[PDB]
Amino acid sequence: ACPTHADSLNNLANIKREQGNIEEAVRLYRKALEVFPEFAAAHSNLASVLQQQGKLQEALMHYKEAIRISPTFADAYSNMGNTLKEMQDVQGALQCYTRAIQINPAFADAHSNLASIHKDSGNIPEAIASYRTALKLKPDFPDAYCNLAHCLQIVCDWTDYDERMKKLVSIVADQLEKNRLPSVHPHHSMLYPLSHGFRKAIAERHGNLCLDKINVLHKPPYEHPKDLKLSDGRLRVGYVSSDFGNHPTSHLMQSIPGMHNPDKFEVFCYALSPDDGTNFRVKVMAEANHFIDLSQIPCNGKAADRIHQDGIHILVNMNGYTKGARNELFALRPAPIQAMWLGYPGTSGALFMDYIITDQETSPAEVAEQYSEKLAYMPHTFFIGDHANMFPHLKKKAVIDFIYDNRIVLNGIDLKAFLDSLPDVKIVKNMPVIPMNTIAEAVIEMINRGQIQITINGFSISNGLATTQINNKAATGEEVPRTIIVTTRSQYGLPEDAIVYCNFNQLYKIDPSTLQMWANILKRVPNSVLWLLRFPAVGEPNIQQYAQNMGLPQNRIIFSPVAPKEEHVRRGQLADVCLDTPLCNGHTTGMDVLWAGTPMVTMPGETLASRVAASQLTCLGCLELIAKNRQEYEDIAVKLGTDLEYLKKVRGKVWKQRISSPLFNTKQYTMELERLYLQMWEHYAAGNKPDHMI
């Protein structure tokens, strides 16, 4: 009836949407549609705010109405693509973006949204190409600039790096001042030189999005247990994770549910992911007191009701802002105590989180300001790994004298029996050494010939590069390998007569400053090499180009492919020293390299993510590997690479202390986690709100 009036109502709705008044936007778009039912722009604009409230099906219905009314409405197609992408319909999203760009070639938002599919598929050069098209058409485009910056970080393109970081910080500042959702993702924010205040505000605004989605449910506050009477004096602990399956989180904590004291604790595991069929999933399902698949319960209201009805005292957030998170569940507060643990190396910034489980080394008291949560300290490190259970063949080793601990390495469950079948095995202060006999030449020939395995004295001797051909489950870490495995520097092109510095982290953890520190070390330690991973492969030529410009020849940096889990951990035995990334430390990869007995040099920063390595080394008991500044990092690394007596001493310390220290003791860890859980409970039950447990 009146397009002009509907049109004013649509514009007013748009102004309200900008101001963050989403409920008022919805009210005004709906009145525009009463005044002009066939108003395509109102259907599409309304669908977008419905998408913000998690009403994806109702959004889809309005987008389809917009396109029914206006078949070449580019905005409706690009907006509908966003809703489909969130519904995990990547195919439909692509059709929508491609259709929006068919219609309007100059549509910056649609190029940026298409870039987001390329990014999410792993196609980073194509994501870069599309983001760059978006920024050429719309130079003021925070979402495209911030996502481009993350793409450039993944592939180690440091073109104009310091000016890039300045514009990132500037965009965040402007979005925080104007009360807009920052275009920098909280998880991504750990890679950029943002103030603690900006990192915490980014987190806080993302946490606050969960409310747009739970507010439309009109759920009242839950009533919480105030004692353990209903649960027989047992504390009900709920572990909420997308990562119960073949995921690093499971490779760290798969043992902890099973190891809880069932006299004091009732363990519930809330999976946000379907069953991926792996032993990781099998074990947590079998060893938890209860296992609830919330992938089956997509409504956060019904899912939260289920947690509340189970009687949970401490609900544990293992995702934070990682893939698969359903922080909406935490936003509804189905549990009286809600704690961040292990999955996310930073603050939620979120009203609905009470505690972050951390430690004095990771999160010292003077940086409490960085976190919205109260600090809950584990006694040594909050970090834990399942290495003792997953990889017990790496508990012991033997070498072939071709005396080096890390040129040719044997590992196996039956290693001692195999060695006892040989007549000429020496020991060293202990390390068994096979001399260059018939057996040794056979083992080496297998490696040089690229053979899968041989038999010696009835014992299966397997090529460490061929584990997936031998036992696919042994390759993933789902089972212990049953053969004796040979690992050699020759398998990876590493020099026999020079120091190997390694870093097995995603390349996005490297910045120019870090590669310059590494170059400084290599130039002080002749013939040494840096061993890095194709993580991903497209990052490799960038690193090489930067390293060559710093004076390092291509042959000083050795790249390997990312390996199946068991080979990645096993081959860390071939390194002399791990050089930790100061920007964001190795977390999982720190535990991995230490389990192989490789010393790791670290420079802790201020962020949780920049201090995990120092916390791991403190728990291990190797303070000599923690640097106070860049000069000290370079000095420690150079000393380990030039003084072979000191190297041997530091390597022995790590080799012994990975067993004797608490670092990999999941039984002691679980016992200390239980102490902390009952201190949180006792504090809540006496009627206190959260406080630091330090």
Binding site: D7, N45, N147
Partner: peptide, 13 residues
Amino acid sequence: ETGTTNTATTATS
């Protein structure tokens, strides 16, 4: 997954 950008349509002329 990567965040996307919704386009607010204002109708024109």
